[PDB]
Design a protein around this ligand. Sequence first.
Ligand SMILES: OC[C@H]1O[C@H](O)[C@@H](O)[C@@H](O)[C@@H]1O
Ligand SMILES: [Ca+2]
Ligand SMILES: [Ca+2]
Ligand SMILES: [Mn+2]
Ligand SMILES: [Mn+2]
Lengths: 239, 240
Amino acid sequence: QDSLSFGFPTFPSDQKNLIFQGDAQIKNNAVQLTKTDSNGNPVASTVGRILFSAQVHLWEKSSSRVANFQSQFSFSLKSPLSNGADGIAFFIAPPDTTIPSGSGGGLLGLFAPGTAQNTSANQVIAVEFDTFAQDSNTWDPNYPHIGIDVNSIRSVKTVKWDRRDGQSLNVLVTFNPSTRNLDVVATYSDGTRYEVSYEVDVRSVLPEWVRVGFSAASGEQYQTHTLESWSFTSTLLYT
Amino acid sequence: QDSLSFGFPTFPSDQKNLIFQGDAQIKNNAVQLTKTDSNGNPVASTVGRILFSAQVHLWEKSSSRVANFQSQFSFSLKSPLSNGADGIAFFIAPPDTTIPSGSGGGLLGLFAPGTAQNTSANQVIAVEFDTFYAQDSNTWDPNYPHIGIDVNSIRSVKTVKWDRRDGQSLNVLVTFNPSTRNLDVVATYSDGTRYEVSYEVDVRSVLPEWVRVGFSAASGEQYQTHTLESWSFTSTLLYT
Ligand SMILES: OC[C@H]1O[C@H](O)[C@@H](O)[C@@H](O)[C@@H]1O
Ligand SMILES: [Ca+2]
Ligand SMILES: [Ca+2]
Ligand SMILES: [Mn+2]
Ligand SMILES: [Mn+2]
């Protein structure tokens, strides 16, 4: 299809179009990307991802068209620790994507250790919300941030962000094929706003058909990564 | 998802979200539901169906919600002879639905010969466009071309006389309103000729909560092409 859209105002347990990977599962009308104990508390060493089943037609060679898409979602992070980790990300990748071997912790379940920083060994665009160390994650700034990843865990750009325990963050990620701008706008309920944009030609990074979803992980330090709602729309346009 | 929508202005050969059953295949940016030869002409004894891969949440027990949906599509029928068979249908059925054994010809690839008229043995809502075309092989339904609404039976609960026009595209709009429980069908040719048929039906008592939607077509001894040219669909769960 040239156009596709779906909306999950909430996530009831009865799902049919979601692909669950790792420890991801539905609990309390929300998606818990990372594992939580029986009491609902986060645990260490966990990775989880979800993908929408239907493939998205991102671009089409024959017609020289590229999709204009919008992804709106909200999530909350919670942890009894002073340093909850590691983060959650919205990502776009090839349809057969699976969790890479040893991609826990700072790799967010998105990249394999051996090629995490090799743009030629990866095909993925992701928007990450990182809450976690200059000794391990020697590739990220010295503070929580929102980062745009293009075939590498080493963000092409980042902006400072504040982690607020248990508070929902509303995010809108849009891509405009005419300007090739990928824009990210995130807000907390009190109006605090964060914005970051990057110009990228998706045709040179991703295949024509892709899948979209979310990934999260916790290493030694942990926190819940709760996806509360998600709406997505994409339509092929002439450029 | 509470809401889902997709649109196929045309059908390129590179499809990823369509389930092809029987002889259905993409050809010339359109879906040929029934088999065609090298010249592109219709052949006999052929059945084909397509379904969208994502499941549609038609209703939700826990919340007491039922979906409002709309399906818009266009198709054309062509045959070397002045008339053709057997017809095409838009249908809604359980996710694992497959072509019933021996459901060719007049059964449109939707029902099994043994229970084609047994409502308790079927779970399907379909809007068919019948053009044959044969009281000898299709004793059911009125004796003239028609559009019919099928609910668990090949014997339409409601029909309206229809005109077959070789090679001309018919634009169809199928809508279901959970508030009135009316399933409305409006079909029109480019010159403005319009056909309307509707029926009240509680989808909850007929189909499971999650379903798949698609099209089916068949040709027995008599044949014609059943070309699906475009299709857009959209559903949203609403409180009743
Ligand atoms: O195709 C016309 C006609 O051919 C045969 O008689 C059978 O397959 C019928 O079901 C069908 O209606
Ligand atoms: Ca980072
Ligand atoms: Ca009929
Ligand atoms: Mn990090
Ligand atoms: Mn018939």
